[PDB]
Amino acid sequence: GTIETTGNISAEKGGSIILQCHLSSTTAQVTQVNWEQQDQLLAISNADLGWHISPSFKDRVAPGPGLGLTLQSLTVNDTGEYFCIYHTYPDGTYTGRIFLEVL
Amino acid sequence: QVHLQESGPGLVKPSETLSLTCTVSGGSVSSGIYYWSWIRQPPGKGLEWIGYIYYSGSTNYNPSLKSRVTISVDTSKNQFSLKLSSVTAADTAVYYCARDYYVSGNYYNVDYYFFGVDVWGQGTTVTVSSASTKGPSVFPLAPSGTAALGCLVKDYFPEPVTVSWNSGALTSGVHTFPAVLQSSGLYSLSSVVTVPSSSLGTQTYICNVNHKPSNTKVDKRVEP
Amino acid sequence: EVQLQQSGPELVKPGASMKISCKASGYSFTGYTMNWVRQSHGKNLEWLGLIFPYNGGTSYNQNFKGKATLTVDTSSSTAYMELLSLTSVDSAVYYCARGVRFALDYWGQGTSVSVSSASTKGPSVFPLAPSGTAALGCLVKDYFPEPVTVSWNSGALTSGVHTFPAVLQSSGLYSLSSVVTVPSSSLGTQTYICNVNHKPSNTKVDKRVEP
Amino acid sequence: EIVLTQSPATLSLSPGERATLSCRASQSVSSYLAWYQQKPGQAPRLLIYDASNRATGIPARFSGSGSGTDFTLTISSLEPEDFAVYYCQQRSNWPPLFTFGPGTKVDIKRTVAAPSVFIFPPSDEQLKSGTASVVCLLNNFYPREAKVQWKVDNALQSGNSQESVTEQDSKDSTYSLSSTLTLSKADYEKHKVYACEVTHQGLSSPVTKSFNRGE
Amino acid sequence: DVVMTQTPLSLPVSFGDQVSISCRSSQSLANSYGNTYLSWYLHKPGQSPQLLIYEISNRFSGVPDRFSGSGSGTDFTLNISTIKPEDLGMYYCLQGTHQPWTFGGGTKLEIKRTVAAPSVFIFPPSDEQLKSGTASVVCLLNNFYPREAKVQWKVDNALQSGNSQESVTEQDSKDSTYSLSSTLTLSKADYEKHKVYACEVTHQGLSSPVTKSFNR
Numbered sequence: 001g002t003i004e005t006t007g008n009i010s011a012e013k014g015g016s017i018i019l020q021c022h023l024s025s026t027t028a029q030v031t032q033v034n035w036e037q038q039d040q041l042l043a044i045s046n047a048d049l050g051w052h053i054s055p056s057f058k059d060r061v062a063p064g065p066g067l068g069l070t071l072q073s074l075t076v077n078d079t080g081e082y083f084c085i086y087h088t089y090p091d092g093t094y095t096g097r098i099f100l101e102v103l
Numbered sequence: 104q105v106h107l108q109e110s111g112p113g114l115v116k117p118s119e120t121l122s123l124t125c126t127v128s129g130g131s132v133s134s135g136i137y138y139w140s141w142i143r144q145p146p147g148k149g150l151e152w153i154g155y156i157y158y159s160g161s162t163n164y165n166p167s168l169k170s171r172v173t174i175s176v177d178t179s180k181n182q183f184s185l186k187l188s189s190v191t192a193a194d195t196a197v198y199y200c201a202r203d204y205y206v207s208g209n210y211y212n213v214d215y216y217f218f219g220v221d222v223w224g225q226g227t228t229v230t231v232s233s234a235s236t237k238g239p240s241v242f243p244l245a246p247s248g249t250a251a252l253g254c255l256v257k258d259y260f261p262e263p264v265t266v267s268w269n270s271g272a273l274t275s276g277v278h279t280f281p282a283v284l285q286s287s288g289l290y291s292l293s294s295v296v297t298v299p300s301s302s303l304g305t306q307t308y309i310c311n312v313n314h315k316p317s318n319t320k321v322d323k324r325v326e327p
Numbered sequence: 328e329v330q331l332q333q334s335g336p337e338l339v340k341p342g343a344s345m346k347i348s349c350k351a352s353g354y355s356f357t358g359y360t361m362n363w364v365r366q367s368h369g370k371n372l373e374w375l376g377l378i379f380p381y382n383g384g385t386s387y388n389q390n391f392k393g394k395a396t397l398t399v400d401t402s403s404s405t406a407y408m409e410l411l412s413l414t415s416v417d418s419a420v421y422y423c424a425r426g427v428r429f430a431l432d433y434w435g436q437g438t439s440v441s442v443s444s445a446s447t448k449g450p451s452v453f454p455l456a457p458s459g460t461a462a463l464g465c466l467v468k469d470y471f472p473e474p475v476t477v478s479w480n481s482g483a484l485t486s487g488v489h490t491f492p493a494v495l496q497s498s499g500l501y502s503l504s505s506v507v508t509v510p511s512s513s514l515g516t517q518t519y520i521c522n523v524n525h526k527p528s529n530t531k532v533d534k535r536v537e538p
Numbered sequence: 539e540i541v542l543t544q545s546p547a548t549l550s551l552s553p554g555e556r557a558t559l560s561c562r563a564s565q566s567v568s569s570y571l572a573w574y575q576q577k578p579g580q581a582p583r584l585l586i587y588d589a590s591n592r593a594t595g596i597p598a599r600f601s602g603s604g605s606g607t608d609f610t611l612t613i614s615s616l617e618p619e620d621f622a623v624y625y626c627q628q629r630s631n632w633p634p635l636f637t638f639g640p641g642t643k644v645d646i647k648r649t650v651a652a653p654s655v656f657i658f659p660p661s662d663e664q665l666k667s668g669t670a671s672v673v674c675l676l677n678n679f680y681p682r683e684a685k686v687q688w689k690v691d692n693a694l695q696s697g698n699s700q701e702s703v704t705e706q707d708s709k710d711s712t713y714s715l716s717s718t719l720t721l722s723k724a725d726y727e728k729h730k731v732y733a734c735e736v737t738h739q740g741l742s743s744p745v746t747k748s749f750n751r752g753e
Numbered sequence: 754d755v756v757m758t759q760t761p762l763s764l765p766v767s768f769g770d771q772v773s774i775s776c777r778s779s780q781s782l783a784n785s786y787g788n789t790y791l792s793w794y795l796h797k798p799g800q801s802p803q804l805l806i807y808e809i810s811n812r813f814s815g816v817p818d819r820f821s822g823s824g825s826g827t828d829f830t831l832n833i834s835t836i837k838p839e840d841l842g843m844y845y846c847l848q849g850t851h852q853p854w855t856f857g858g859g860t861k862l863e864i865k866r867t868v869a870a871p872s873v874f875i876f877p878p879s880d881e882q883l884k885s886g887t888a889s890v891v892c893l894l895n896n897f898y899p900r901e902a903k904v905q906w907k908v909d910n911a912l913q914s915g916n917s918q919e920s921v922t923e924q925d926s927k928d929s930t931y932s933l934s935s936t937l938t939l940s941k942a943d944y945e946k947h948k949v950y951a952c953e954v955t956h957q958g959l960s961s962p963v964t965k966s967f968n969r
Contacts, residue, residue, distance in 0.1 A: 005852075009784055020785070040213070041207070046218065054213060055568065076381060080384040081852065089134075090131030150625060152638070165636075201581075216631075223583075242671070251656040280704055281702050370843070371856075371859070374847075388853035429850065430792035432807070433804075451885075453878075453882045454879055462895060466891060468889065492922075502936070504934045
């Protein structure tokens with residue numbers, strides 16, 4: 001099983017960026033997708049319940065497109081690497097990586 | 104879909120330890136998404152959280168109970184369990200195994216538990232008492248436009264008693280009343296069903312009384 | 328302009344952990360990511376990770392999980408790299424380099440880090456004796472660490488000289504051979520002396536090479 | 539400690555009406571609150587999570603709102619199958635942890651329905667027991683207030699009956715009530731007519747239903 | 754991980770020529786916004802690696818105009834209009850569109866010249882080295898081109914394996930040739946158990962292999 005990503009992104013302050021991943025080559029069903037950084041939670045997409053968006057990001061993150069998410073009003077402090085953690089039924093755990101650079 | 108099922112005894116003597124087990128279906132107890140929880144509800148009162156366990160073995164219990172609670176997990180049996188020691192009557196309740204959501208320790212910006220308890224078991228009633236189990240006696244409530252017939256389920260302990268009609272087939276008009284506590288200290292209960300009068304001669308009606316705490320089941324045919 | 332000065336070279340024994348520094352100047356140190364590259368065997372390049380000094384965020388090549396740790400001191404525009412539990416396989420040059428739109432536009436001079444369990448030892452010098460042109464030389468064997476220098480006739484003989492790169496033997500010690508092509512007519516008349524010097528052990532040797 | 543309170547303890551509304559339930563926290567718990575529904579005899583169901591997010595598949599008339607110390611679950615248009623107890627749960631990291639509120643019970647207001655009365659004589663299997671239980675059934679009535687009178691040879695029986703009332707039906711919103719008259723076989727075989735007298739809003743006249751031993 | 758295969762790994766060239774290096778990527782290096790983060794780097798021997806071209810075609814500040822970059826998708830090319838002695842070194846392509854960043858294998862630009870045969874010599878171990886129990890037998894290939902050279906040790910026509918190491922000089926400043934040392938290492942026990950020690954060299958400048966040997 002493999003994950004393909006948007007690819008590393010360079011954006012400017014105040015811009016908007018989509019972070020998306022695609023799970024390929026697997027017979028596994030996706031129960032939940034966690035969007036995270038090394039130390040913080042951005043959003044979770046759960047198949048049974050729905051989306052959860054961490055209060056830190058509720059002003060500038062919208063669910064979608066698909067199992068991805070959209071960032072508004074990019075700041076330089078966003079510069080970092082973002083993870084799309086796919087939790088599949090029931091073995092689980094596929095991981096994708098996307099670095100965003102701002103200025 | 105995940106289905107949880109509780110098992111274990113319904114009667115536990117004072118000072119001994121309550122032990123329950125939850126079996127997971129349509130999913131893996133090893134899934135890293137979930138906390139496996141226990142939640143109880145004493146009769147007529149609200150819900151109280153006991154604790155949860157993660158598939159890695161780590162736990163988190165209710166501080167008012169942590170001195171006596173031990174939750175464990177077996178990944179190969181697809182089960183997780185609860186042991187509660189030195190029980191008193193304060194522990195009489197319906198006990199649900201349930202499913203909650205794991206919060207990674209890596210989230211510095213998450214000081215909360217997201218989502219909620221979205222899957223529950225059926226719950227099993229455990230009563231802490233020194234008395235022995237007593238199965239119920241079942242008597243007919245015989246029918247004389249539309250007719251009423253039923254079963255009297257008398258002198259049992261502890262709760263609960265479930266009553267179905269024609270082995271689950273008869274649904275409409277079934278009324279099973281809350282148990283009342285008699286002077287004897289034993290419970291009693293009646294279940295009735297409204298039925299067309301035209302049927303009484305052709306269609307037969309049997310109440311299926313189940314009292315799990317004593318492993319007794321009684322089928323009573325009701326006839327004019 | 329943009330200048331990146333790394334710390335000096337270090338020899339450590341396997342199991343040790345050391346910290347490389349990279350002092351930045353000439354730009355806003357927190358506005359750009361500080362990357363780290365490994366250069367193995369003189370040829371192969373490997374991206375190890377980066378640190379964004381504005382907020383301290385790190386990203387690591389997962390092929391090297393737990394081998395490095397990246398930190399910064401913004402009050403001194405210094406980026407750091409702690410290499411952990413080092414083995415011989417980690418003997419390499421480690422580069423500091425600034426990141427801009429996923430390219431590395433400015434590099435540090437590099438820090439050569441050597442990992443070996445050997446102890447300092449001077450070489451033994453043996454003669455590669457000659458039998459129109461005639462090849463003679465010296466074999467400089469079993470020294471540690473690098474480097475050693477070989478001259479011929481105290482600097483007077485310099486043409487036709489070939490000093491090969493040192494090769495690490497399975498013993499953990501180095502060996503090296505210096506040869507010179509000379510005329511055949513001169514084997515009997517001209518003396519030939521290779522002058523070997525191994526400063527790490529204060530060892531100077533002069534070996535005459537006879538037919 | 540975090541202390542959760544729920545008001546009203548009881549609502550009584552007609553189908554189609556707006557029900558608003560309130561949950562309150564001793565100190566702030568931001569968005570870290572879930573709402574649960576529990577119908578009689580069943581386990582709770584998660585309706586709302588993180589204050590305002592309805593769970594997938596949950597009917598759209600359920601919606602949660604608020605923050606901090608004041609939270610509200612709204613059933614915008616009550617359906618009769620919504621008869622249930624509704625609990626809030628705090629989901630922060632504050633000491634009590636996963637505390638549930640006391641709950642709000644939502645009763646369904648319907649039109650008056652008179653009870654259909656049945657009387658059952660003791661089974662002949664139970665007469666060998668040495669006790670005789672006589673059951674009176676009031677079926678599918680509203681409101682709950684009803685009085686049942688036992689007359690044994692027109693002698694108001696007293697202190698030997700127990701009443702059990704069901705909980706409001708999920709489809710037609712009615713109650714049903716059994717009253718059991720427990721006697722010794724001695725006293726039962728010494729009288730003749732056993733009558734159950736029911737008075738209720740929905741009856742213009744009190745209803746009596748009776749039998750005579752040896753029917 | 755993206756695998757950047759680079760071609761060729763070595764290229765002997767003539768000053769004044771036009772060189773092209775191709776970098777071939779195991780998957781597209783374009784993000785969902787059409788930015789392709791491919792850069793070319795140069796590492797001369799005396800220096801630290803320097804950026805030449807970034808994002809396929811853009812030339813970094815200070816780079817001569819001879820350096821130009823083209824390509825798209827999964828194959829890219831570096832063009833050098835006219836190579837000067839200072840353009841020699843090792844070139845690397847790098848992709849930063851996908852975590853982790855991966856480099857190419859590297860291309861080493863060398864000096865082209867005519868074929869030239871090695872002078873082969875074989876040296877037996879010294880009596881002084883044998884006094885301590887090990888025997889070093891050395892075989893010298895002197896001033897050859899190209900670098901392709903196969904040396905085979907034969908001890909009584911026993912093809913050796915694993916008990917010898919090689920070392921090669923860089924291209925000589927004056928005639929751009931190579932010299933090579935092959936050192937066979939034995940114990941003194943094994944060394945004095947055999948008689949004939951041979952070094953057999955195969956190289957493009959020799960019509961047929963050359964064997965230089967000695968008797969112990």
